Write an enzyme that holds these catalytic residues in place. Structure first.
Site, short mmCIF file in Angstrom:
data_model
loop_
_atom_site.label_atom_id
_atom_site.label_comp_id
_atom_site.label_asym_id
_atom_site.label_seq_id
_atom_site.Cartn_x
_atom_site.Cartn_y
_atom_site.Cartn_z
N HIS A 61 0.78 -1.19 -0.04
CA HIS A 61 -0.10 -0.02 -0.13
C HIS A 61 0.81 1.32 0.13
O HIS A 61 0.53 2.18 0.42
CB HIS A 61 -0.83 0.05 1.05
CG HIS A 61 -2.08 -1.07 1.10
ND1 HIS A 61 -1.70 -2.34 1.52
CD2 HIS A 61 -3.21 -1.21 0.65
CE1 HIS A 61 -2.96 -2.98 1.30
NE2 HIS A 61 -3.79 -2.34 0.73
N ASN A 134 -9.70 -2.78 3.11
CA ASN A 134 -9.69 -3.05 1.61
C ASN A 134 -10.90 -2.57 0.94
O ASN A 134 -12.13 -2.75 1.56
CB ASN A 134 -9.08 -4.28 1.32
CG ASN A 134 -7.51 -4.31 1.33
OD1 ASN A 134 -6.78 -3.33 1.45
ND2 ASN A 134 -6.88 -5.59 1.20
N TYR A 348 2.20 -5.12 11.96
CA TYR A 348 2.04 -3.52 11.99
C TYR A 348 2.56 -2.91 13.10
O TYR A 348 3.07 -1.53 12.84
CB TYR A 348 0.54 -3.42 11.95
CG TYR A 348 -0.25 -3.57 10.66
CD1 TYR A 348 -0.37 -4.81 10.49
CD2 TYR A 348 -0.63 -2.48 9.98
CE1 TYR A 348 -1.06 -5.03 9.20
CE2 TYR A 348 -1.42 -2.90 8.81
CZ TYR A 348 -1.85 -4.30 8.52
OH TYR A 348 -2.46 -4.67 7.02
C1 HDD Z 1 1.20 -10.42 8.10
C2 HDD Z 1 1.20 -9.46 7.22
C3 HDD Z 1 0.17 -8.71 6.48
C4 HDD Z 1 -1.13 -9.41 6.37
C5 HDD Z 1 -1.50 -10.82 6.26
C6 HDD Z 1 -1.85 -8.07 6.09
N1 HDD Z 1 -1.06 -7.11 5.95
FE1 HDD Z 1 -1.80 -5.05 5.37
N2 HDD Z 1 0.01 -4.50 5.93
C7 HDD Z 1 1.00 -5.10 6.52
C8 HDD Z 1 1.16 -6.43 6.36
C9 HDD Z 1 0.08 -7.50 6.51
C10 HDD Z 1 2.32 -4.15 6.88
C11 HDD Z 1 3.42 -4.56 6.11
O1 HDD Z 1 2.30 -4.32 8.28
C12 HDD Z 1 1.53 -2.82 6.49
C13 HDD Z 1 2.54 -1.95 5.40
C14 HDD Z 1 2.76 -0.66 6.00
C15 HDD Z 1 1.96 -0.65 7.35
O2 HDD Z 1 2.25 0.17 8.14
O3 HDD Z 1 1.49 -2.00 7.59
C16 HDD Z 1 0.26 -3.15 5.65
C17 HDD Z 1 -0.21 -2.29 5.05
C18 HDD Z 1 -1.84 -2.16 4.95
C19 HDD Z 1 -2.32 -0.90 4.45
C20 HDD Z 1 -2.11 0.48 4.25
C21 HDD Z 1 -2.31 1.31 5.55
C22 HDD Z 1 -2.13 2.82 5.21
O4 HDD Z 1 -2.63 3.24 4.42
O5 HDD Z 1 -0.93 3.29 5.88
C23 HDD Z 1 -3.99 -1.41 4.25
C24 HDD Z 1 -5.25 -0.76 3.88
C25 HDD Z 1 -3.57 -2.64 4.72
N3 HDD Z 1 -2.44 -3.27 4.73
C26 HDD Z 1 -4.85 -3.59 4.60
C27 HDD Z 1 -4.84 -5.29 5.24
C28 HDD Z 1 -6.17 -5.90 4.82
C29 HDD Z 1 -7.73 -5.55 4.48
C30 HDD Z 1 -5.60 -7.53 4.89
C31 HDD Z 1 -6.34 -8.59 4.81
C32 HDD Z 1 -7.54 -8.76 5.55
C33 HDD Z 1 -4.16 -7.19 5.08
N4 HDD Z 1 -3.69 -5.79 5.08
C34 HDD Z 1 -3.29 -8.20 5.46
#
Ligand code: HDD
Ligand code: HDD
Ligand code: CA
Ligand code: CA
Ligand code: CA
Lengths: 673, 671, 355
Positions: A61, A134, A348
């Protein structure tokens, strides 16, 4: 809202960061043509700051945009949740929302085909509560441990970092075809939900089942749904691709503009609510993030209104630095044993160390809560507090036992839903209740319109035809075929392989409401929609017609752009900069008909290309003034076609054209298999 | 070249980073539908790594691509420089080059209009030597201290971060019009040099004057010129915009493919050499980075051949992590008192702390030298060495005085050119010698062809029409008018302002060779160029035609894509995925004429749109086998339009058109 | 040493964790904290942290990335890298596996097991297992520390907990700080002992190699240095580290009285030729030679005078000739044989007062 942190530079003399007045335009040198001096602290402070401006982009994202606003509760919801921000009719809580794509790096196009983020922070009076959602209600995978495999496969191939912001390559489809859980989200991403018209014209979903928990400890299972009040709309792919080049910022600009014009977007914040005892009552497992609860089985309860109405002041400080966590949870909500959600909790909190470079990321203005902080967290790089309590340990007598422990019975503590239980072996195994990867993708597909189903087939045709491996392509057709034989047959056609024989195990004819874009009726409002008016300076008549159209259209909240060869009073844009991707509807004034039959002022055939593009992409198009056949004939547009307008009367023209804007797309212009 | 650092995972069982065999597909849970356990170290190690994958992008030039290669010296250059990598005929030095845009973030499109980076590392036998250049020989500003001002103004507006990868907004043109030093680079950027056809079809420049220093201490002033051996070529703007959507990876893909096919790009590495006494002899100051030395005053000397012939194994490890510095200098080269250069030396050392997160960035494989390292640098996060010398200070006896000091007379030390001198007050003042900001922009403009000049006016028309502020637009016209009245008149016309009265202080009629793209003759090679053959599966004759065209074209090193409605044997790409931006020439086979007259397999009109797009963008287009040409409204008598029954006659004509590359008669000119 | 980054999460097949709630949390902490120390995620690539076997995994990138990975399809499941790397587990590839007998049951709770609630009985067992003098040392450490606690209420609260382990401990520590012990509370009192926890009870050391012997001599008499030299030869043969101390350095002398201290020695020998020093110099602080001998004795070390004339040294130090761990022989051989037994005994605990 963050007014206390704002810095004003509308007056005053330049200073260092320590308040010493300085200059910053010429280096200090040994002589007028001499070498620069090490003692030039003015130079070095400014350049050091610049050298260090960047921070790591989000791991996913990375490309996105945000806004402030307000949530308002419709009721006292104590009957279902202890959550404070829901505890009173009319109760208001400030929010910040970031939208995003998913795969692309931070400078990639808004209008890539992707999953989109919709992340919402409620700065509640009992702590910050994030719903990190999402635009698509299901996810690719069923266990958080698989997250890097998914992301590696979807992001560019790691020898050459090609391709940007796209699943259209071998690795992504290799993963999809080897990991069939992906089918449901894949189908969503290959529909119009992959290319929404704007952030405002999509919904948000929490995806996971969560728990609502009352003060008495009882719990119910919920799904979050943020339902758009602007309606649901998408691009067509061939428009999206051009848009990605013409305006990479389309979505962020659309949002900024809607907010600046007083048209800040709105959602209804809703939940599906079901009993703990219904976790497996619906023919699947509510712990499985690849499934929806069809609305027929459980209706939406509307909790309140989310409105975004204030743009950030500094994008970096606010949008880039906002750090969401599903671990930002409040009393009255709890997690479930969704193995995807479970792992997110860890990710996160850990990732912000990477972005911030240090442990004090919750002290950034955009991350701060709006209530007091009382704990014994100390020190760390970038510590901004000066703690008075010099006995930061529990238990203590030397600070009189403060801060006090909070829990179910005291201090309005968070508490784990006390009904929750665990049993069995400590296992690294998948629940067999997770095993049906295909029925719900088929349900989704069944629920699309015939032309919508074509769009989805055509997206798969596009992407899969770019997969180089024959073996991957065969494996892809194997999985598609398990969802629907017809889909497999139609996409195999494009790639010159044969589809495998029908396998009916998961086939069925069921449908569910509320997932189709093209089926969701006309838009409920046309405010903010963009009308291009193609005119000319060569006839004073044409500019007159344009001005008349403008006046009538702007009364109804449309954003009007008059286009001509050159700028001047009343003309917003030159043909050189104009493109069909810039408009939701295109009108030619018949005074300008000659341009649609060469100029150093714009690329050859530009005026007519904008009209032809708009028509082919399904937009309302028309000629105003009464003489339409020259323009329509040049464009190969039939005068009697749906969403093609021809009137002399300006009032009649606009009345018809505005119905066409609400219809939004005329899908009769797209061929079906 | 970096083989020692490679890790092979083509066999074996999954392990942790400490070699314990594990799995990574299911979390450890309390029960089969239970919560995940904190003690799952397999989960946490994997997800922690992923959580921390990203590093800050470069502050500028964030979007780029790299490749390995070799430099080969043409001669023993000891008579002009002591530089070891230039000291023998045929002497070879490994290189790594990164090309880039300038303003855009990671992920933004290769075909934005921008300055381009061309940074070259020579891993010499006397240390790493970097030349950190651009494709444009002059820079916007005259003092390093202004760099963050320039960059802030050019990058997206900081309230909303719009627009991406573009100077087409108020702030960039506010700065340009208030800081007229920017005029020369601006004119370059608004020319075809802003939108090169590839990395391979552009030159590289060091920009600054540097010094060549001999072993005897004497010095001369030099400019680096890397002259492309593929020739120079550009896109047109209306093509570039589409390309940015259709394929953001166009340049990096073009480079990758050229190398993979045994067609690695080459440049002649050249210098202009002039005497120290000629610092001010050419009507401007050689310390001023907004000025070129016309080749009429100082011809190029070819020093050697640069070739890129090896793609990286891991993009992140090699391309993303490569950390260039102009401070990476070797004996035989020295700096000048160019105040822009001067400040770069500070910036590139400091900035790697940001990118790497610690002080040991030179220990990354891509940054390591290819000779032994002997110094008393110690410790720091991420320290990869284990130093045997436990007395790392100078002067010492306890390590017998090692390492020993290197200098002009010992150990082949770097030395500052000994003739260099400083005199006068310690000043924050600009030399009056820098004050002419307009003559050379006019020189450049004068040296472009008529249609080239039109393209540049039209780029300014495009950008300046998007600037909202009336006062900024007027200020821009004031500056352009100091370069050329005619330019100011022609751009003012597009924006509904009046041009200011002619002000002839800096007007003149002089020209200089080597700066024009369209004027530089046909391309010296057409190998790698892309031909799209538009065909149909509905006629076997069409496919036979396409297959026969393929065989004849591929002989000559062209990349041929046969397009039809669906994939099958002999067809590379569907009309659905095909676009004219993907081809350097487009051929329609006679047998497919019906397609150019609806289908669920591609967007309406797609086949003819490709052909028409290509024609209007100046490409060689043809039918092999008048019906098609009529539908397209393409004139049979057009230059670069081809119409032949015989495949052999067609190809022979069409290949001439590919070398011409663009037919500029298809573009309208002012008045 | 500085960069070594330990983890309990560094575990191998054949070993597993338990549900020790202290251990459980450590597993998180040691992985996370290395990000702080290293400043980035590739800390396992530091030489001291690297394994001595091949690494095969799909971890990528991060700051400070030292590898160049050839596998361009680092995801599972894949076909494009032929399914490698392969999953390792109980049945394949010698994988780590959680002990499969392991099980959980019950509510998800933030609650402490009542099985954990006896905090006092084992402290009592430990105390019971020390020798009398050893118990006195422990009481005295508590006396030292608790007397520096400024808050009266804290000191009272401390006495409360001490009293639950041992009333005698509470009474004796309380005497030093001027409060009363609470009344005996015998809920957790007992007389049980356990072997192998005592230091002073664990008998003489099994080897005296490496132990440090300071020989206090003088340059004023050439006979004193001859004596020191004879002792050195005899002692070094048995692997003791011998320091000869005199007023100034020269051949045979290792350090000056100025730098010498009793803390530098496990035993201290005076050569009787140096007796006059124990009775002012610009070369060392007043009374330094005698102080080294007095400190050594008072701290329980074997101390002696070699050569036959002991009474002037011993008398100045108030050390009794007949004391245990006090040696006085003319014979170098006899002196060393006796002294070395004292070094194995290590401390002479009869020199410390008991309550
Ligand atoms: C275990 C790892 C992993 C899993 C399974 C998920 N993601 Fe995530 N997500 C992250 C690891 C993560 C992250 C790498 O931790 C991020 C990247 C930047 C952040 O701050 O967290 C993130 C980013 C992040 C963002 C951007 C937030 C922003 O705008 O700053 C959104 C909207 C989501 N994700 C949504 C979800 C949805 C709806 C999931 C499934 C239900 C999902 N993610 C699964
Ligand atoms: C005082 C600041 C300063 C100024 C005056 C310059 N730059 Fe720079 N440049 C940087 C500070 C900077 C930097 C911010 O330090 C970068 C960004 C990332 C990095 O490693 O160095 C850099 C990036 C960098 C890159 C990318 C290198 C790569 O591919 O990794 C190139 C090609 C150049 N610049 C070239 C130039 C040229 C030809 C200039 C004018 C003669 C110039 N820069 C002026
Ligand atoms: Ca791939
Ligand atoms: Ca701006
Ligand atoms: Ca750091």
């Amino acid at each position: 809202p963050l007014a206390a942190y704002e810095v004003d530079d509308s007056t005053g003399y330049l200073t260092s960061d320590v308040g010493g007045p300085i200059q910053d335009q010429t280096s200090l040198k040994a002589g007028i043509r001499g070498p620069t001096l090490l003692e030039d602290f003015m130079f070095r402070q400014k350049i050091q700051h610049f050298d260090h401006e960047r921070v790591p982009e989000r791991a996913v994202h990375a490309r996105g945009a945000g806004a402030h606003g307000t949530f308002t509760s419709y009721a006292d919801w104590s009957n279902i949740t202890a959550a404070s921000f829901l505890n009173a009719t009319g109760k208001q809580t400030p929010v910040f929302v970031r939208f995003s794509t998913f795969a692309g790096s931070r400078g990639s196009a808004d209008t890539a085909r992707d999953v989109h983020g919709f992340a919402t922070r409620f700065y509640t009076d009992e702590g910050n509560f994030d719903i990190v959602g999402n635009n698509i209600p299901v996810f690719f995978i069923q266990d958080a441990i698989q997250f890097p495999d998914l992301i590696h496969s979807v992001k560019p191939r790691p020898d050459n970092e090609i391709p940007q912001a796209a699943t259209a390559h071998d690795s992504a489809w290799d993963f999809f075809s080897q990991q069939p859980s992906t089918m449901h989200t894949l189908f969503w991403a290959m529909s119009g939900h992959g290319i929404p018209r704007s952030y405002r014209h999509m919904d948000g979903f929490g995806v996971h089942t969560f728990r609502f928990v009352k003060d008495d400890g009882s719990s119910k299972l919920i799904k979050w749904h943020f339902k758009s009040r602007q309606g649901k709309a998408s691009l067509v792919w061939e428009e999206a691709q051009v848009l990605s080049g013409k305006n990479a910022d389309f979505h962020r600009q659309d949002l900024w503009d809607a907010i600046e014009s007083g048209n800040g977007p709105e959602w209804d914040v809703c939940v599906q609510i079901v009993d703990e005892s219904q976790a497996q009552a619906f023919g699947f497992d509510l712990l499985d993030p690849t499934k929806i609860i069809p609305e027929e089985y459980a209706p939406l309860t509307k909790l309140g209104l989310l409105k975004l109405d204030r743009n950030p002041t500094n994008y970096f400080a606010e949008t880039e630095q906002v750090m969401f966590q599903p671990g930002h949870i409040v009393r009255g909500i709890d997690f479930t044993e969704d193995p995807l959600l479970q792992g997110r909790l860890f990710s996160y909190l850990d990732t912000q160390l990477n972005r911030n470079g240090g442990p004090n990321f919750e002290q950034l203005p955009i991350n701060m809560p709006r209530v007091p902080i009382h704990n014994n967290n100390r020190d760390g790089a970038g510590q901004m507090f000066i703690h008075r309590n010099k006995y930061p340990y529990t238990p203590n007598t030397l600070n009189s036992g403060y801060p006090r422990q909070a829990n179910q019975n005291a201090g309005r503590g968070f508490f784990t839903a006390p009904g929750r239980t665990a049993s069995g072996a400590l296992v690294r195994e998948v629940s067999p209740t997770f095993n049906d990867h295909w029925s719900q993708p088929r349900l989704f597909f069944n629920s699309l319109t015939p032309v919508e189903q074509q769009f989805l087939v055509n997206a798969m045709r596009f992407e899969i035809s770019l997969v180089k491996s024959e073996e991957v392509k065969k494996n892809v057709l194997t999985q598609l075929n398990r969802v629907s034989h017809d889909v497999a047959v139609r996409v195999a056609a494009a790639i010159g392989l044969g589809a495998p024989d029908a396998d009916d195990t998961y086939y069925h004819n069921n449908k569910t409401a509320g997932v189709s874009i093209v089926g969701s009726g006309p838009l409920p409002t046309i405010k903010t929609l963009r009308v291009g008016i193609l005119a000319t300076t060569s006839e004073s008549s044409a500019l007159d017609q344009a001005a008349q159209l403008r006046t009538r259209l702007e009364k109804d909240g449309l954003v009007v752009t008059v286009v001509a060869e050159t700028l001047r009073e009343g003309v917003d844009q030159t043909y050189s900069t104009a493109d069909a991707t810039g408009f939701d509807g295109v009108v030619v004034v018949d005074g300008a008909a000659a341009l649609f039959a060469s100029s150093p002022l714009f690329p050859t055939g530009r005026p007519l290309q904008i009209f032809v593009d708009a028509y082919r992409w399904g937009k309302p198009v028309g000629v105003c003034g009464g003489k339409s056949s020259e323009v329509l004939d040049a464009a190969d547009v039939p005068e009697d076609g749906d969403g093609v307008y021809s009137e002399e009367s300006v009032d009649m023209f606009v009345e018809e054209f505005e119905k066409g804007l609400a219809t939004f797309r005329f899908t009769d212009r797209f061929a079906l298999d």
